[PDB]
Amino acid sequence: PKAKTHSGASKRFRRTGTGKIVRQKANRRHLLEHKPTKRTRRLDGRTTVSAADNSRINKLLNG
Amino acid sequence: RGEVSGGGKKPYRQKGTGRARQGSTRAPQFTGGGTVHGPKPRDYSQRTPKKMIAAALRGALSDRARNDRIHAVTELVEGQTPSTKSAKTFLGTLTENKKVLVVIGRTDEVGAKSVRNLPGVHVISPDQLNTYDVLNADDVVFSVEALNAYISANSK
Amino acid sequence: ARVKRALNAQKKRRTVLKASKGYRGQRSRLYRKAKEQQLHSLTYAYRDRRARKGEFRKLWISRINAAARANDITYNRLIQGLKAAGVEVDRKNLAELAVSDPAAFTALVDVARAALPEDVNAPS
RNA sequence: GUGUAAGUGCACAAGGGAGCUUGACUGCGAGACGGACAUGUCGAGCAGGGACGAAAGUCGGGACUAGUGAUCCGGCACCUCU
RNA sequence: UCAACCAUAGACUCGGCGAAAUUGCACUACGAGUAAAGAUGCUCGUUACGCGCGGCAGGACGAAAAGACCCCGGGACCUUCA
RNA sequence: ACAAACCAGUGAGAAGCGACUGUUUACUAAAAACACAGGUCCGUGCGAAGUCGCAAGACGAUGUAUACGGACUGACGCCUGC
RNA sequence: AUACACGGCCCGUACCCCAAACCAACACAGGUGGUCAGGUAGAGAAUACUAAGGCGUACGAGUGAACUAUGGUUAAGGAACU
RNA sequence: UUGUGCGCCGAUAAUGUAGCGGGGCUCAAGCACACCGCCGAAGCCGCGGCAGCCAACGUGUUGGCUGGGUAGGGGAGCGUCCUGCAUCCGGUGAAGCCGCCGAGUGAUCGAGUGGUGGAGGGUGUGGGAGUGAGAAUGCAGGCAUGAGUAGCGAUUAGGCAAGUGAGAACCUUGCCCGCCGAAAGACCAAGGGUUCCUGGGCCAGGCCAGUCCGCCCAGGGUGAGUCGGGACCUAAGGCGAGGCCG
RNA sequence: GGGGAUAAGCUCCGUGCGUCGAGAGGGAAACAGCCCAGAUCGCCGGCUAAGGCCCCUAAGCGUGUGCUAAGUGGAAAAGGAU
RNA sequence: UCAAACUCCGUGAUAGCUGGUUCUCCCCGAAAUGCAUUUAGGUGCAGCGUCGCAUGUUUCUUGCCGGAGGUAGAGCUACUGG
RNA sequence: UCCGGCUCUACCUGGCUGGAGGGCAGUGAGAAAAUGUUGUGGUUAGCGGAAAUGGCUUGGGAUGGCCUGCCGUAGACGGUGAGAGCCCGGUACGUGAAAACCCGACGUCUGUCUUGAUGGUGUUCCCGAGUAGCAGCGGGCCCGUGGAAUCUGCUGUGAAUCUGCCGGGACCACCCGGUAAGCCUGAAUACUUCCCAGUGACCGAUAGCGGAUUAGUACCGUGAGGGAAUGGUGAAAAGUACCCCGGGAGGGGAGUGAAAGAGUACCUGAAACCGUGCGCUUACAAUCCGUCAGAGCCCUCGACGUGUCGUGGGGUGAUGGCGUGCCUUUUGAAGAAUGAGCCUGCGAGUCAGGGACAUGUCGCGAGGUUAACCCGGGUGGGGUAGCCGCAGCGAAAGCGAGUCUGAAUAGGGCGUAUCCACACAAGAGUGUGUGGUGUAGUGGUGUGUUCUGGACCCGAAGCGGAGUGAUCUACCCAUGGCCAGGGUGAAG
RNA sequence: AAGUGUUUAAGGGCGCAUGGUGGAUGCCUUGGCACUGGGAGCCGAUGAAGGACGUAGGAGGCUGCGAUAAGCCUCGGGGAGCUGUCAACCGAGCGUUGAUCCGAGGAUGUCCGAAUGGGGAAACCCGGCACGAGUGAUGUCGUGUCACCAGGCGCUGAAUAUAUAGGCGUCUGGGGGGAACGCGGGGAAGUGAAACAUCUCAGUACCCGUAGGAAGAGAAAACAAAAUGUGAUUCCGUGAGUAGUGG
């Protein structure tokens, strides 16, 4: 049987051209008043996932 | 243990008896019980690439040709009188070997039948040529039409 | 294919039980109990092959001490004198001399007593 | 005495007072700290448009470190997206 | 108190049939120790001719029952303003 | 030694509980537990109420409030307060 | 009404049946409903003995061991046992 | 009187010396300080063999270093079966089994040998595995230990003679004795199902034995208008035409 | 170093501290964690470590100078003590 | 056999739990810590192992040098307290 | 095409209905049966079918070995006294059906058209009604009520007939497509109780179906239901006549047999286990049962010389030293923690998938590869649909070796395979341009992990579905029966 | 006098040799498993499937058969032994005038079972009617037939008038079984989510109703997207574990 990909991980992670797996960052949806803009800027965009989480994330994404 | 007959009920109480714990008389450790990791029906057909197959065939025929084991003939015997005597004598001229692969069209029933009962002979059609048969053969013997058919198929 | 394993299995059993001849009771008769002992037996043999050197040394020393004290000298000063005299003879052959050539043992004792100092309890 | 615990600091004042003000900004961020991960933290400097200041310069909240809650889901406003 | 005696059925003996739980082994001592902190099995000693029969039940942490008490985990059933 | 053997009540006093005869945990509990007659309350106006049933239908009852069901109490006596 | 001559079907019917034949895994000290109910004593279908009738029912022979079980007797005392 | 080096008392549990491991030790075999040798390990060295890593040089030898090992990782292999191919052995005796003589670093090997045996196997190279057990209170079979041990199933009790027979405590006959006698007697139902009778048997069964048997074998045996039942009747209850409900 | 009674073979931490774990061998009488030392195999070869050299038990009833009289050695306190 | 019978099926129920998991040798070789956890006897990640690849002494040890600390100790008429 | 009779009636002219030539189809979904004749068409029995008595040898026996021949459209598989192409059944190949049945074909026969079609012009009628649609509650669609279309059940409400209605993912408009509420419809597809012929890198009697055997039997259970074990003499019974011991059983002689070390307990005949015999040892000894040393005894192989020695080998072991079982699980067990009585068998990381990741190997290579499927008595040949690579960035529109953010030429993110050289900027960690080099994937397959699956094996208590059970027991219903004897002494 | 000193084996241990038990191993098989290719894909009131009871000259089991009872008739085939088998033995016989045996078609086919004359504890009890036999007659025997429901057809048409319900008769059919597959309905839970209820398991298991040899679906009130597009349905592969959906 075909291996299913994890839906949440496919929705939260993305590959670049070089195969880097990237992630959005947390603490950004709400409670943003007290969060200074330097913090939200730090939390904006994407970052490459950690080496530790890479294996599990790749397994989830591929099947 | 699921396919074996019975073994549905626990043979006895889990506790009290001094016996080991069991859940079915058809468990693997039981005599008469199921086979744990046993054969099941499976297809072993490998999904070999076409170029690999063809290249192996060509390598086999090339070994035979280099060693001068490919012979060609017009027909194994004359018309509509299958003569295993004739075919045997003819192949004896062409080769003293035991293992021979006769490649002939599907319409040469006469030659096929004549050479069929010989022990070390294997008959095939050129459209069914294969590395195993070519390599099991010590000699190969085409009919001219069969050879040219293989040629005209593998050229274009 | 299905494999009847008795044929491969009985080999180690034959081996062990042939090794365990002379054992008492189960240890000579049963694979599972002979096997337990062959472990112990070969462990003991490995241990004892190395302790045998020590035991034979102990024996040779006992005999040398005996013969020496019969020649009025202690083992220790005998060894001291032999090492000072450059006699590389080993304790095995010294014991063999003590048993078979007491005269030669006495000669070596004289050699060692000569090679010893005049005050063995001095620092020098 | 430092808004408030304690500690580290602050008299060069970060403590007290007055004037003007809104940087308690927007877009960004070299480089680092810390670091299982997720979190978290500092940040010179560039621009925009400003405050104060004669100017240099400082200001991306508060002397510092606590004062908070991932994600999902949904709401509101705006957007030359669909 | 305070136990004595008698018979009978067993136990005992002979003949006959003939199980059982249990069983890692075995030519399975005691003391004081040591040790997973209570030793036939280790240490130092002591004692002990070999093999049985009838008996006793101190130990073999004896047999039996994968402790029911306790806890952890999971069930079941019961209750209720979960 | 006269009920000769066999057979064949032990008795008395008091307290607690339950009134009693009965019933009960087949296989550790026969009891002070259950039931009981008696009592009170509640429901039911009749293919009742209640119950088994999806329904039909059935029991209740071939009965009709002096009956039927449910609950609690549990002979009897004195009582059953807020 | 009489006489004569005829037909009266199917199943069960042996044997055990308080047991060695049934239920009990056994030729198991258990359980199994009904019918006959002798005599002498006796209230009696109790109990003792016995008739008719049926058994000696299936391991035995021995032996004054402890000990156990079942029965029996017990001085003086008489619940001191517990 | 000060400090020190050795000591004394304080001192004191319960199976048996039992607070040196023991004997025994002060004629130290005790303590301190110096000194001298020796023993003492799988440590180190020596001789030899093996393997791993690396290096060098040469196109496989030498040398150095290393080589305890649980979970665990990696590598390389033995053995078993089935197979493609090629070969080989085999009724002039394959396999399997038992041994002898041996071999390998290991799993293990034996195209070395004998015995037994009677028909298929070995080798090489690949392919595939129901591929290796000592444990799961594992499963099945067989066999031990206990053990020639307990027990041999009530509360009646057996005995003698004679017989039969290969064989008798038990079977048969007779005589005694004893037990039941609201039963341990007699008859039925239910249930069982031939256990009944005759003849024959005795390797299983019978808790011993057995000539006996409710065991085995064969054959025979159950006769009804009136007995118990149907053909007669209905109860509880069941099935239930149609039917209703679903 | 905390907790604990600055008790626990206690518990909780730290320690480019160790060992056992997963580590044999020698010593410590025996004795995972102490000391020595990290086992490729073999040898009837040698030197050593720790520890020991009267006999058990291999090596010294070693040498020299003193001490000890308590078998101290071969358990122990405050404190006592020509 | 009853706090929900038995049988078959679902079903090879699921069990963070227990048990078991079979031939060899060669090399290397742990951990029992941190964080988080309906978590604490489980698991994820990190740490620690192995293998492979890449890099190549960056590791580690010692000497020297540059540095920050506030422990031990000490001190307090140098603060807070006693 | 022709004729006839009607076409209210007769009269001219417009439709219908019968008969006739002919087509057109048909036992079909398209209307339905029957009927025959007939196919070396098939199935249901079978039959034939070549070629060695070959020699020598071994052997009980030749089907072995060596050597001779022979057939071969037959060397497939079995059997026969041991590996048989030539001994047998058979095989290749070829024949064979009275009857029945099934496929056909030919026709009878049936139906239909045949008074028919052809192609045009403008208005009214019809084009499937309790339907669609709508609402409410639901179901199912990727879609778990969500903005939820489409489809669909129930309940209500309830239209339009073509400028009508439905769908095109709420909805509206336009456009497109279609024409619901009426029916039928073969093939491709799924399956195998059963029958026939075959195959197996399937089992080979604890395996394989539970069942090679008395098998769903015996047996267990009231019942549902559960559910076994038991194969091999030998080539041929030639199955041991006869005598002896014995009551028999069983045995010994004799015989059969190649072999009774094949005797209906029977192929081989392991181990546990049980014995017997010989050698050594052991009754003053404290033993994880062994190991190391080893006396003595016995046996053996060689030598010399005549029994002592050896490069020895074995069995026993007095005696001394050392020495705390295996496994599991543990900080740690000889452990008085677990498990194991013993032997023999059986008993646990397996399988599938174009699965995922990594690695090895092979093929091809900026390409690689097919899937389904088609043809092949095969493993082979076709098959380009797709898949992965080949350009990324971005939420996306989109742009593109750039792109996103952003007012930014102003920085950052991701990407531009990598490396080399040069040049210019910088020394805020180096960047920017130029040139060059030029990018390596993919599909098989092995291995290791992994996903979905029972997923290494065993193990619950318990959950659910459907059934079996009140012959035990609880209660009840109907109908029967039983309660010796003796007392007390109510009402009336 | 003092000292040294074997010698015992009641039994045991080790080894060796011979045996026994037991039934492993090896080699086999009359059997089975998985498949392939074809066939046939239904059987039943003309009484099924499956059974009970009987049946051969001799006891039983299997097999076959059914009171015509290891069998009867016909049509073929075949060709010399045969009287099925466990499993022989005995006793009888048959057979080239063609047996046994093989195939096809028929006949017979007790009793039960949908079970159907009625009843019933399945395989056993009681019958009615017609015909026939048998009896002095009753008794007895045999052959047929006799269920219920639906649908037609004919007669009649209650309360009650229309008439209907219903009743009577006749005819046609159904009824039950079957391993899998199919269609329509109903519809779990263990489990997984490391709890759990949404969700999953799963529209599974199971159940119900129904068939057919296949079924169902099927000839657009479809798809599609502006391509002059395709053009019933089903099935396979892809699309794609994607779009999406999802506490």
Side-chain angles (χ1 to χ4, degrees), chain B residues 21-145:
Chain B
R21 319 171 293 198
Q22 303 296 349
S24 168
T25 61
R26 309 304 202 190
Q29 60 267 22
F30 270 86
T31 286
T35 318
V36 183
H37 292 322
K40 294 276 170 184
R42 61 190 287 211
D43 194 2
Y44 300 83
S45 55
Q46 292 179 37
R47 191 178 137 158
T48 320
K50 309 197 255 190
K51 298 184 163 132
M52 296 176 71
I53 294 153
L57 171 53
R58 292 162 183 172
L61 287 158
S62 302
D63 200 60
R64 297 285 171 290
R66 290 165 186 200
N67 300 271
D68 305 70
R69 306 298 192 74
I70 283 155
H71 314 265
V73 305
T74 78
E75 57 187 20
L76 294 164
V77 301
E78 305 299 338
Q80 296 84 46
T81 179
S83 165
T84 298
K85 293 254 282 165
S86 293
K88 197 209 199 177
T89 310
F90 192 18
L91 300 196
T93 57
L94 301 173
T95 180
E96 291 80 339
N97 280 311
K98 324 306 298 301
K99 286 285 208 61
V100 172
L101 175 60
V102 172
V103 188
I104 54 185
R106 290 168 188 161
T107 57
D108 198 350
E109 292 283 296
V110 54
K113 287 182 159 178
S114 69
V115 81
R116 193 169 60 186
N117 202 59
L118 308 177
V121 164
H122 186 244
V123 168
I124 203 177
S125 164
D127 50 32
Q128 289 289 298
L129 269 159
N130 63 85
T131 309
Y132 169 80
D133 292 331
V134 170
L135 291 173
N136 197 17
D138 291 18
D139 274 303
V140 190
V141 173
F142 295 86
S143 286
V144 182
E145 48 159 1

Side-chain angles (χ1 to χ4, degrees), chain C residues 1 5 11-12 14 35-36 57 77 91 120:
Chain C
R5 83 203 207 202
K11 290 166 182 189
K12 50 176 156 66
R14 289 178 206 119
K35 190 188 163 178
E36 287 179 38
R57 201 183 156 81
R77 304 302 179 182
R91 289 151 179 73
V120 296

Side-chain angles (χ1 to χ4, degrees), chain A residues 32-44:
Chain A
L32 297 148
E33 176 270 340
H34 79 97
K35 278 167 194 162
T37 312
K38 53 181 171 177
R39 188 170 167 199
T40 59
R41 177 161 58 252
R42 160 164 84 248
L43 301 164
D44 205 350

